[PDB]
Amino acid sequence: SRSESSIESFFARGACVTIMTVDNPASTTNKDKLFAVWKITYKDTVQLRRKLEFFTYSRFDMELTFVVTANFTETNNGHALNQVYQIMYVPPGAPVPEKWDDYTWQTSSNPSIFYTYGTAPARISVPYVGISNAYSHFYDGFSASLNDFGILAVRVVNDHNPTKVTSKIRVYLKPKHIRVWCPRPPRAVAY
Amino acid sequence: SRSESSIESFFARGACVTIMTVDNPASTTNKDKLFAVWKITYKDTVQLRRKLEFFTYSRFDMELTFVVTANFTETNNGHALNQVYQIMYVPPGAPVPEKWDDYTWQTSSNPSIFYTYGTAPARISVPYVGISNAYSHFYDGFSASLNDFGILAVRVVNDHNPTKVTSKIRVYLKPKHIRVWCPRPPRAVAY
Amino acid sequence: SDRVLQLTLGNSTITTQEAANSVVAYGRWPEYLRPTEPDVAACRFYTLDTVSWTKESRGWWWKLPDALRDMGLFGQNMYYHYLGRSGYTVHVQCNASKFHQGALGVFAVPEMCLAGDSNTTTMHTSYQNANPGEKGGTFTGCPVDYLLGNGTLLGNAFVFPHQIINLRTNNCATLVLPYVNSLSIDSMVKHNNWGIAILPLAPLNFASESSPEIPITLTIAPMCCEFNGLRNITL
Amino acid sequence: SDRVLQLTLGNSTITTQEAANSVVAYGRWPEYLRPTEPDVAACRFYTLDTVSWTKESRGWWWKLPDALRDMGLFGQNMYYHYLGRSGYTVHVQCNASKFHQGALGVFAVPEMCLAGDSNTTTMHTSYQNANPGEKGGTFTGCPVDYLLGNGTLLGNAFVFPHQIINLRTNNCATLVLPYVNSLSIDSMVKHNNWGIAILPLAPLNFASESSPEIPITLTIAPMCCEFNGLRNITL
Amino acid sequence: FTFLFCGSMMATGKLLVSYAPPGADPPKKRKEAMLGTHVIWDIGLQSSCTMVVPWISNTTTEGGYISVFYQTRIVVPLSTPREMDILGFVSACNDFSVRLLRDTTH
């Protein structure tokens, strides 16, 4: 009897990949400026990374869940109306945004999702968007530059509010329908 | 193998067309007065415009999505109860409103949608409302005055509040079931 | 084992051990991509630099097709074709007596990378150092031997298909590796498919004084090779 | 003549005149010796140095296979095989208008020797001077033009198979020459089978001022080539 | 690739269209291009030349090259303008398609 043990249940978990931070300041703070940009990789985390690394090749439908919690940074009795956050999924190779202003931010192509705080977390799925037939966790030679599933972009959709509201985008990934080729001994230590 | 490449997926995108601004002032501000009026065209934007312009004739079911975010303009600790915004879709050739007061604003014909802030964005659809068999992106000669899909109208439904709440209507358009006749070389530069 | 037979791939002459157990990588045979197909011209035994297994040795390693870059016909197609794929019949023989004692470990690592926990940046090593040709490379006690040169505790190096040349048993290694990679065809020049490494499992010990060390041999034959687009015939 | 068709010997592209009369040497077709057979690799159109037919010209000449020594695949087999034989489809086109007047003479001399009544000693000329490659040689008014460069009154140069590129007729030359020699196979390096020479029968005269001269082109295809013994693959 | 010879009916010559697939560098001398896939195109026989390009792939870093060479040279009849032109027309093949939709507008 061998079930839960199978591939489709070795990765059938919702593990965090990244934690991105945004804000809605009325003041001029260009550092953590409104926008948040992060390169879609598994590389940042630990848990999910080692798991995949048991193999050399893969194919997986890539789903993502975005729970978003906020708060008021300054010790003030100030207020804020419920907010919205546009989550821009960017497919590999496109123009990467900076200033939350730019044309790219209107996309007309890139799938984006607007979410209103204080509800059931954000959710989408990107099927096997491999430029090859598989996602090579390792690649020996010269073109490291992995595969690239794209980049995630989130900003505060609502305008500048007298009371600065800081938020966080906890990103989780369930690699549904995963397939793997030729295993390696796993990484002994830490990264 | 040619799919995503086909017409039904060349335009199967939700691209912004316009960003309209409203307010709920207790003070007398007749400029950005309560009402917002905008001529339904693709002409304002860039991205969506060039796309269509690849062809000379078209038919498309015209859907629209209205995400609405707000805020308090004045640096005050003042408050506001959740609001509602009547979105008036106006079919081409009707009386265009001014003062948010007028008879037209009661319509009895024009489809309008009331929305309560802080939920799933506003959504409707207008099928091929062409006075011809197709929407000519270009038309050579004399009657420029395009085709006219009508005008969008939004106001704050709730009465005057001591604390002035400014909102924005981000309008997106997915031209579902689109059909095109005789292509032109696309516009080289900018508009 | 006696009754050993030679196979002549037109030009090449073998005279194996006999047969005494062979290894197929994940029970798969090299078959054609479903192009320039040289067949017999570039599907014939080529012998790499015979290396010296010494008491002190840490091991050896080669990349595919890298090693066979300077190999006549196969190497031509390789250099004259942008797109290309192939298979390999690895044959590592090591002959000693009944007065020598040791165990050889031949592994087949698809994409055999080496060192640097600087995942941030891999390859790093220079193009020349990453591609040491027919002459081959050696592990060091940087290809850290007991970490497969790649930070991974060697005791598991048995994940990849392999045979153990145990002196007191078979004096040969026979590994068949069909084409592995995400791509259907590949830049042979730039990308290395397989990694044939040969490390000592048991050390080399010889009775009294004899052969102060012994020799290991790698002759490999390309299996069903093909290529795309004949580029400029640069001579 | 219109309706001209291209033939693609894998790599090569032709687009002939159309067809307008071809010549078979002694009504014989190149057939296999009844070996290394490259086929399509070395049986594909190669273009020699296009030369300039000028009022003043005396003629031009090439040796087979000599000219095609520096020709990719065919030249490899040629240099890598001690014993070897072949055939050739000589195609000499010369395009002008209805404002040019002249007559070109293309001859196929099996063993086209040049000069020296010193029968006592032939060859004499140096190995390099006897083998001028793709670039070709020219007659002089020493290859004495009206003596076929070989002491024999040119008026008879019509013994060998030939076509006359008469400007006002066909703007092409199509000569097929099966393998001729006493031997069944030969030292391609050392021995030249055929001699394609092209001399003016009528001079070049052009109306008023136009093309101060015109161009002649030699693209030839080896016909059923084979070789014996693959020597050292010297790269 | 399709070429239109924009010279006189009276004018002639042979040109050479070449394509060295990826990896190979531009073939600097006639011979180098000629050695590979080449098309000898006679002017004095037709104005229309078409040479199809085989297998290629994108990520918008190096591909192939297409080149034109004076196989022979231009034959001018009598007193005709010694400098005429040519027109090139590229078009996709049946097998040509696309994937992953992006943009650019300002």
Side-chain angles (χ1 to χ4, degrees), chain C residues 50-199:
Chain C
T50 303
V51 288
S52 183
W53 191 40
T54 65
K55 293 189 177 297
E56 35 290 343
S57 303
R58 303 314 308 162
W60 296 265
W61 55 271
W62 295 263
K63 304 293 185 63
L64 289 171
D66 175 27
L68 307 175
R69 62 180 181 176
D70 304 336
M71 296 301 179
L73 302 171
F74 171 82
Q76 307 314 319
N77 312 348
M78 174 182 172
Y79 288 108
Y80 302 113
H81 302 94
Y82 185 80
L83 310 78
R85 59 161 292 174
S86 181
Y88 312 98
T89 299
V90 187
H91 201 89
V92 184
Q93 287 174 130
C94 183
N95 51 350
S97 65
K98 301 177 180 63
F99 308 87
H100 294 79
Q101 53 191 3
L104 290 164
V106 189
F107 319 109
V109 182
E111 308 291 330
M112 186 187 66
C113 309
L114 59 69
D117 297 11
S118 299
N119 301 177
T120 60
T121 303
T122 72
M123 57 172 56
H124 49 264
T125 306
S126 64
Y127 183 86
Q128 302 78 21
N129 283 356
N131 300 341
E134 61 180 13
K135 56 183 178 298
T138 63
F139 285 79
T140 173
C142 178
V144 285
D145 52 12
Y146 67 95
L147 288 176
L148 184 61
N150 49 50
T152 59
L153 294 172
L154 199 67
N156 298 325
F158 303 86
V159 292
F160 316 99
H162 64 282
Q163 292 186 20
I164 307 169
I165 298 179
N166 182 18
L167 289 184
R168 58 158 287 100
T169 317
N170 300 357
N171 299 162
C172 59
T174 320
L175 301 182
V176 177
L177 306 173
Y179 179 85
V180 175
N181 187 27
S182 59
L183 307 173
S184 297
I185 202 174
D186 196 347
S187 174
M188 287 188 173
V189 177
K190 299 180 177 180
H191 179 279
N192 292 334
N193 299 339
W194 292 93
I196 297 300
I198 310 171
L199 298 73

Side-chain angles (χ1 to χ4, degrees), chain D residues 11 13-17 44 47-50 70 93 95-97 99-100 134 208-211 213 215 217, chain E residues 10 12-14 30-31 34-42 45 71-79 82:
Chain D
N11 190 14
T13 304
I14 314 174
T15 41
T16 59
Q17 178 283 154
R44 56 162 296 264
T47 298
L48 296 179
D49 293 352
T50 303
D70 304 336
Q93 287 174 130
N95 51 350
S97 65
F99 308 87
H100 294 79
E134 61 180 13
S208 176
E209 180 195 346
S210 310
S211 300
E213 39 65 29
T217 314
Chain E
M10 296 316 193
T12 86
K14 302 180 191 299
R30 187 197 65 178
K31 181 182 180 63
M34 176 288 299
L35 295 165
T37 308
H38 63 287
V39 171
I40 303 172
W41 169 53
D42 187 354
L45 293 178
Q71 163 57 359
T72 54
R73 73 164 199 88
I74 290 302
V75 328
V76 285
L78 181 47
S79 299
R82 308 179 69 174

